[PDB]
Every structure is written in C-alpha cells, then in structure tokens.
Design a protein around this ligand. Sequence first.
Ligand SMILES: Nc1nc2c(ncn2[C@@H]2O[C@H](COP(=O)(O)OP(=O)(O)OP(=O)(O)O)[C@@H](O)[C@H]2O)c(=O)[nH]1
Ligand SMILES: Nc1nc2c(ncn2[C@@H]2O[C@H](COP(=O)(O)OP(=O)(O)O)[C@@H](O)[C@H]2O)c(=O)[nH]1
Ligand SMILES: [Mg+2]
Lengths: 430, 256, 91, 430
Amino acid sequence: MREVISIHVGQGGIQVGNACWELFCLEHGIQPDGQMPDAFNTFFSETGAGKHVPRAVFLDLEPTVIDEVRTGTYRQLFHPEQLISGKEDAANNFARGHYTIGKEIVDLCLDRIRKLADNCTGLQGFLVFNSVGGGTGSGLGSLLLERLSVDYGKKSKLGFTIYPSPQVSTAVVEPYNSILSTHSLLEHTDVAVMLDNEAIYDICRRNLDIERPTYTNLNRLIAQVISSLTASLRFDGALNVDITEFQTNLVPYPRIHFMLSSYAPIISAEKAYHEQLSVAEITNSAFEPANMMAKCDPRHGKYMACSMMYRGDVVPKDVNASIATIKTKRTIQFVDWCPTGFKVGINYQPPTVVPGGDLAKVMRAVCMISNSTAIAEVFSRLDHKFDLMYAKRAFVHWYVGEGMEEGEFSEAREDLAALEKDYEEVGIET
Amino acid sequence: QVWKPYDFLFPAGRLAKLVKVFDVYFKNFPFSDLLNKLKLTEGYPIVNLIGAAQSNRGKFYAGLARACFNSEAIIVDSAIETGLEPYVIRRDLKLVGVAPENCVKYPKINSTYKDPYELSNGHTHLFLVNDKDKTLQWSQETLFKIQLILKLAEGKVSKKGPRCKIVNVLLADTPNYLDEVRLAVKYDLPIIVCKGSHICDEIIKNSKAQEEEKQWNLVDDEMQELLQKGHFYMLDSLDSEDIAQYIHFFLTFTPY
Amino acid sequence: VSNFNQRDAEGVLLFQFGSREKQIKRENKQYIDLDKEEQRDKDTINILLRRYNKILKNVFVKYSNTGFSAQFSNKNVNSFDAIKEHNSLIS
Amino acid sequence: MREIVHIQGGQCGNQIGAKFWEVISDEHGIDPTGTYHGDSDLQLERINVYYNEATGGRYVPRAILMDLEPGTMDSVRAGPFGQLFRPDNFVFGQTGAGNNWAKGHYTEGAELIDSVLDVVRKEAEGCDCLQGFQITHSLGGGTGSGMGTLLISKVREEYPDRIMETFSVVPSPKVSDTVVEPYNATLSVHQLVENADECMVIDNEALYDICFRTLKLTTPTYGDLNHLVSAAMSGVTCCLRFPGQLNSDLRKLAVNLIPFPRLHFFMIGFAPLTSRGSQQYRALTVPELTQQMFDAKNMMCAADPRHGRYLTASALFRGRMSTKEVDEQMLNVQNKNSSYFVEWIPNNIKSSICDIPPKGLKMAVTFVGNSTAIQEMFKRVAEQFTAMFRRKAFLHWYTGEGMDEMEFTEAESNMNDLVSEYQQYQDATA
Ligand SMILES: Nc1nc2c(ncn2[C@@H]2O[C@H](COP(=O)(O)OP(=O)(O)OP(=O)(O)O)[C@@H](O)[C@H]2O)c(=O)[nH]1
Ligand SMILES: Nc1nc2c(ncn2[C@@H]2O[C@H](COP(=O)(O)OP(=O)(O)O)[C@@H](O)[C@H]2O)c(=O)[nH]1
Ligand SMILES: [Mg+2]
C-alpha cells in the first residue's frame, strides 16, 4: 500500500529511465514481456491476470527516442499511451519548452498523472529525471513541477538533475537554461541531487578500469543509486527509512536542499573477490572526495547532515564502530550547530547484478546522500559562465523571440546571488 | 557652483534632466547658462499649474495636454503626481517640475507604495531647489519657479522679440497656492481658476454671486484682495475641450 | 529588478550629465487604451467599428484561414470544435 | 515528421542537386527506378524526410527544379537517377538571364516565379510537420543569384517561423569564369543576410585545393567537387534521419551557432579524406578525425581560420563510438588553441553523435564553425566591386532594366557595415 511515480522527460531522462527499468524488472523477477514466469507494488500495478505495468511516464517532444523504446524488447511492457511524444523539438531553447510547444503537451501529461494517481492508495511521492542542459528537459520539467506543486500541494517530489560539468560541455548555451531551471526548481522541488557527468567518468576510469565509457555505463550507476535509495520501501530491514523521513533529517532550511551523492563499492569481478569488502573499508571509500558522484570537493566546505544507506548482511554495531572512526578523522569536519549528523539505514537485500554489465555481485554496499556547504562552487562557476555572455547579451534573441521577457534573466541571477549569500551565512559558526 | 545638472532615470519611466540648485537665494541666478545647458534656449509658451496635486481631473488634463501640444507650450508644476503624466508622455510634452528637494522623495525601484510627494514619471526636467542649510519648505521655491517661467518664456536674449505668453492655471489641490498667486498677480499674468478643488469651486461660486451673497469659508482675506487686483478668469467646467480652448486663447492673446 | 538580498530600494536614479543620451541614441537605432482616452474618441471609434463591422468581419474571415498551419492539417484535427476555434483566430 | 523540401536554382545548383540526390538515394538503398532494395530496417523508418510515397510503392523526391533556360534540366534528366524527379516540378523559361542579375530578379524572374511558387506552396502545405527549406544556388550567376534570392524573400514572407538553409557558392577572385561576378555577388549578399536563417559558403578554389592536396588525384572534375559538397550536405541532417546518442535537428544547431541574428555565415569541412593509395595506411580513430577536422586546409573555403577567432563551433560525429573520448578530445582541441577561441563565451563547441555511419565508412565527421575569419571574402568581393563600379563599367546592362545606381550604393554600404560589425566582436574583450 505504498507507491511512487517516476517522471522521465528529455533524452537524458528517458535514457536513464530505461537504465533504471531494466534493473527494477530484473530485481523483481519480471520478464521483459511483463509476465512473471508482494514487493512489486511500490513500482508496479497488477492488471488482474498476468502482466505488470510500470508506474512511469515518458515525455519528449522529439520522437526518435520514444520510437526506439516502442520497438525494442520492452515494447510490451509500457502502456502504449503513456509514452507521450511531440513532433517538434525545443532545440536546446528553454523558452520554447516553457512557453511555445510545451504548453500544448503538458495537459496530456497531467491527465496521465491523474489517471495513474487515482490508482495508488498510499502515494509516497514523485520522482523526476531530467538533464538540465537542454531545452525540452529543463523547460518541461519546470512546467510540470509548477503544475504539480499546485495540483497536489504537500506531496513530496524528488529531482535527479544532471548539471553540466565544470569544463566539459556538449552544448554552448547550456548555462542559460541551467540557471533558469535552477531558478524554477529552487522554490518548487523538495530534494535535488547532483549528477554531473565528469565525476562519474572519473569514477568509471579509476575503479571500473574502462577507458572508453558510453552513456549506458553512467546510467547503470545512476540506476543502482536509485535502487539503493528506494530499497527500504520494498524489502524487510532492521532500520527502515521512508521518503517522507528526509526533509526532517537532511534539510536544515527550506532553501537548502541541494546535496551530492556517492556510492561504494564500485569494483569489477576480475579483482573484487581478492579483498574482503568489510563494512569499514566500504564506508571509508564512500567518504573519499574522489568518489563523489558530483565533481565537487567536500574538503572545501563543512558537512551539514549525512544520510547513508546500507544493504546486505551488515550488522548495526559494525556501522557504529565505523561512524566513530569517521568522526575521529581530522580531515572531515561538521558544522558547529550539528553535534550528530548521521542518519543510518540498514537493509537485508544485497544489490542485484545486471548481466553483461560492469559491476560484480557483492554482499555489502553503501549509498550516502550528504548535504554539504561546499556545493556553492558549482553555483559560482555557472554564474561566472553566465555573466560572460550575458554582459554582451549574446544568444538572447533566440529567447526573446520565443515569448520570454527581457527581465526574466536578471531575476534568476538575483536568486542565485541570494542562494550563494545564504550558503555563506549558514556555514559560519556561532 | 550654484547649480548642478544630472540625468535622472525614473524607475520603469523616462529619462529626465534633474538640476539641483544649492542656493535659491543666490543673487542674479545664472538662468541663461542653466537653460543653455538644458537646451531650453527658445522662447516657449508656458502653462503654469498652481497648487497641482493628485486629483480626479483625468479628461481635463487630456484637454490641457492637447492645447499645450498644439501651442508647443511647456507645462510647469510642483514635480509631484497630478494625473497629467500619461498625456504628457504620449504627446512628448515638456513637463517641468519645481520643488524643494527636502519636500519631495525620489521614487523607489519596484515600490508597491507610492508616496504622494514622490517625483512623478512624465517630468522631462526637474528643478530641486535648496537653501544653504537644506531647510526649504513648500512656497519658498515659488520665487525661483516664477523667475524660471519668465526666463523660459523670454528665451535667448539675442531673439529680439516679445516674450512668449504665460498662463497660470489655479488648481489649488494643495493649500500652498497663495504665494504663487501673489507673484503671478505682481507680474501681471493671467490666472485661470479651474473647477474641481474646494478652493477653486468657492472662488467660482462667489464670482457668480452678488456681493451681498458672497460667502468665504476656505479662501483667505489676502486671496480676496488678490482676486480684485489680478486678471482672474473663471472656468466652471471640467470638460477637456473647454480648458483646451481657454489655454489656447490665453497663449495666443492677452485679453487685458 | 531587486538584487540578491535586496528586499527594496530605488533601482533607477542617477547618471552622469545625460551621458546615457549617446547610449539611448545607439539603443533606439505605445498602446492606445480607448478606456483611458477621451470619451469622444472612444465613442467615435466604437461608432466607426460598428459601421464597418461587416467589412472588418469579412476581412477577418478572409485572412484567418489563409495561413499554412501544419497543426491543423486535416488528419489530426479530431474535433469540429478545434477547427471552429482555429477559424475564429487570425495569425 | 519534421521533414524538409529541396529547392534548387541555376545550373550550379542543379548540378549540386544531381549528386546530392544520388548520394541520398545510395544511402537509403533506392534504385534509380524508385524501388527500395536496401538491407537494414533503419533504411525505411525515416524515409519521409526527403522522399514522398506514390502508388505502386515507388518513391519520389520532393525537389523543385527551376532555371531560366531549359538546357540544364533537359540534361540532368538523362543522367543517372534522373528519372526520380517528378516531371511536374520542372519549371523553366524560354529566354534566360545571361548572367545579368537585373534580368533574373526584376524583368524575367518576376513573371515566372508565380508558377514555381505555386508548386512550392503545394509541397509545403501538404507535408506532415514542416522543419524547413534548404536552398542550393550560386552567387556567380545572374538567374540563380537573382531568382533564388527573391524566392528566399517570398518564402520568408509566408513562413516566418520555419527555418531556412542556403548553400551558396561565392565567386572567388582566383578562379574567375565570369567578368560580372562582383556585381551580382554584391547585390545578392545584400538580400541574403536579411532573410536566410543559415548560410554556408562554398568556394571552387578551396575544392580544387583540397582535391589536389589531400586526395592527391591528378585530374579533378566538377563531379568530385559536387561529390564533396554532397557528402558535406548529407552529413548535416544525418542524425535527423537516424537514431543516435544525442539527436540534434537543424533548429538546435541554429540556436547554438548563431549568437546574433545577423551572424549566420558558416564555413564547413568534411573528414576523413584520404588518397586511394593511403587508405590502407591510416587507422580511423577519434583523434585522427578531430585533428583533420580542425585542419585549416580542410575547410571548404579559402578563408584562413587561424587569421581570426572562432565565435563557436559544431561537430556531427557519425558511427558508433564512446562519448567520453569525444568530449575529452573536444576539450583538448580547445585548451591547446585558446588563442583562436573568443574568451567571453566559454565552452563554445557543440558535439553530436549518430550511430549510423556513411555507407563504406566506419566513422565520419561534419564540421560547421562560425568564425570571424570570413571577413576576408567580403573584403575582396567589395574591393573588386568598388574597383569596377567607380568607372561605371558594365552598368548600362543593369540600368537598362529599371535598376539604378542607388541600389548599388545601398548594397555596398550594407555589405561594408556587415564586414565592420562582424569584426567588431573579434576585438571585443571581457
Ligand atoms: N548522464 C547523462 N547525461 C546525458 C545523457 N544524454 C544527454 N545528457 C546530457 O543532457 C544535456 C543536453 O540535454 P539532452 O538530454 O541531451 O536533450 P534534451 O534534455 O532532450 O533537450 P533538447 O535538446 O531540447 O532535446 C547534455 O549536456 C548532456 O550532458 C545521458 O545519456 N546520460
Ligand atoms: N561545383 C560545381 N560548380 C559549377 C558547376 N558548373 C558551374 N559551376 C560554377 O558556377 C559558376 C557559374 O554559374 P552559372 O552557371 O552562370 O549560374 P547560373 O547563371 O544560375 O546558370 C562558375 O564560376 C562555376 O565555378 C558544377 O558542375 N559543379
Ligand atoms: Mg532531445
């Protein structure tokens, strides 16, 4: 009687949704056709006899990815008319997907959301995935969040956004729409998790020893993180954690809800079994700055609160004996007004392996969600990138001619300045 | 330096020229150099609003603005919001505000509350007058305002011609009209008494009444003496066409 | 626009001696609200719009369906009401 | 969906199209009889982009061919793949222009253009969702440079929101085949900047240089130049017809490569290009592709790109390859050449990946970069124009058909203003 609905918008969102939906189907024993040859209820729904239907909706204005989905092996799984598709792409223009073509599509998506919500009885909250540096992704994510915040109100929404890397970039105009989308979801999303690609590339290179990774390898790690986060809702555990038990433990103030994640262990089968993978060493590896899932240095800032999930055969006393060691270290310092900052969850189900993938099978794993003061650097560098081109009003004509006003750029800049001032104000000791 | 010009940007408004006057009592104030720097060097017909403040005269101000546009007249007021501003902006009229700097407020950016003594958008030229001690109050600027009006109407000294016509419009929406009327009568300037304020309505009503039926409840004895000595013309209409006809007449012809 | 941490102040007060004049000239290189206009202009325009309403409606109907909208290409207009709404709009 | 129609004018444009359509048909496996004989399923999924469907199962291009003389279209019909074109789309006059811009734009081109506009309107009104138009024509001829540019304005007036492409061959002073080239080049550039959403300049001199130096073939002919131009043309829209990691339609390139609406003159290049004798020596790798892609001699224009600074750049990779390598190589090509990239817009290179390579090649790259070095072409064109105009040479031919010298003066002034304001941003600093 506990449910959650995941929203996938944009090319990156759909490509990570595919990645998480192989993993969930594999973890619950459901074949790609949707047929089994009481834990499924969190992500799926029973049709009365036979197949299961995911509680997910796919959105995009550009039809190529959806058409690829509707012809692959998973054509029989998803309901045919929840893969909403458009005709014309926003083409990396934020104003397009927020004012011009997204408005005519958003009504169908909201109707689908209502039709899925009326089925659930114990709706925990929503999940949303969107790559921020794109037109349709950021614009439609903003519009959907704004509609949901007023249609439903206090229901919790979680956002797994992928911000651009510090120096590596695929587009040339992504700072503009990244800043605008951050403006939009700052006052509209309860949790936002950092996911830039460069850090995960470094993780793959160093640990998985892959020298030529593709997007699928990144999306599989993200899917594993999602599964670790939501395992506690569908498996028995000695110390459970619910989604609604987050803003009471990781969010000191309503404005501050951007945090960065990490995962451990990450190791290949060729050298995994030569070492014992004790809980102490994995919880040490999870706190290593080089294993952050976002390219930010935690040594440059304080910690505010750490929520970290275990799964497997871990014993609570071993967890406490390792939290003590971390509190001992002099290179990791917490904020003054937080004496204890750890929330611990323990689950029994070990992580599942996907055949043909990178990760091996292990009995212990740890996933941490940590809120730290050091996150302000990404905001500062994105702001610096934005200012350089906004000084000469470059690329603005592509946005003014799509219905957006001239002054809309300035107030996003003011909100980022306010956020940066707030992060500095919080981190000073009393 | 007795005066300093600035560019003044109204929030969500037009660019104006703002002049700070540091000593209003300065002997032989250099109006020629001031007006040259502002490019106000031609002789202009002047409509001076006496006691102008926020009022329900909307259509009357549309007629006044039309007559001023057709006569190329400069409107002079007290730099505060009157309801003339929309018509002045649309017709590109010159609106000159003269006020004590201490009695007016600068407009706030994105203020939800307008102060009634805020500088109004629509003024093309603002003259903020001070004394040496910055203690100037309303009515103390009046001598500077009339000297400025006379110089605007004369234009450049090299144009050998009569000054342009000046008409005063007594609105009396503020109580501080008396000193400006006293100076207008002293300079032999026509004064149109316009309906719509309690003071003007009393003057118009008493102008039509027989001497034995005259009741003065709001008008001071000094103003009653000025009404006998000056050239006062009663406008018992709020019609936009009637005020336009009066202004156009007095800017073209002197009936006395 | 208020800055970071600025609830409010004044955002547009003073520049050096009309310097902005050169900048405004480079940069430069109004809606008539009938409800705020003179009552005579409102009434005369409404009389003219009534007189010529049949012409204006013929012109409106003549041009409102002349544009090529890919959206209303015959196959996807599922309802007569959507066609009627489109035919009531001019681009 | 999101398909485009083809319109070509003049002899040069007709010869370019005669190879462009052959290349497209060979890519999609369409026989010269209009019958599909392809091997892969993907060859038919998005065939509606360029081809229409008729009874009997054969396919017909949606191309419109126009010229003021019938010879070139009477010759292209007898060539290979000449039967695909619908006979109804052939429109021609009986007089010709004689390389006189005035005749092809005021007297003769004005009366004929109604018939071709009728078929253009027929083609555009019918199609599912319009993406836009692409135009091939030459600026060195009268009828082409006149009728094509007037047709550009007529199309823009009726479809202001669609996108417009123009592949324009400008007359180089090295290989000159017509004495009146500067006049109709300068007159055409005046109108082309006002209406074209994108423009791509191509020079015969650069094509001869490439053929002589990189391919090292003894006797170049127009067939080789046409083949190179056709490969470059096909490379731009490849990801719109095939799936890929990051699809990017023409509008997305328009957003990311044009900073200001008047700066839309790009120069392109295609890689790899190797000689017959050295095609076995080389190994196709991403570094090998990217080193040839930014090579100065590889540009399809004689303009020297190290004489200026790139405002932005774009690359459209083809084939199956890792994205991490592409991103790191793009970063490396931008760190080692920081002097030739403008500094007030960071991360000014756009990348895209398409999983379907060209037939016969495993990897390919199409490069589209907006650079300030293009000023040199307009400088020399205007220099020749002002050298010839000061004596009023050949002016009577133009002035005898209703044109005057005032339109020449305005065109020269506007072209010089474009030259100046294009380099204005080269010296701009942050
Ligand atoms: N982690 C990850 N990021 C991706 C993936 N695909 C695209 N991105 C990121 O998404 C950004 C651009 O947005 P996209 O998702 O590609 O496109 P979009 O969101 O659909 O927006 P449009 O361009 O209008 O279609 C790029 O900067 C990439 O970094 C992916 O598969 N995995
Ligand atoms: N690439 C290519 N260029 C050509 C070909 N034929 C002519 N040209 C170029 O076109 C120019 C002459 O254009 P022209 O034929 O007069 O155009 P028209 O007036 O529209 O017919 C010459 O400078 C040639 O360089 C061809 O087959 N291929
Ligand atoms: Mg996309």
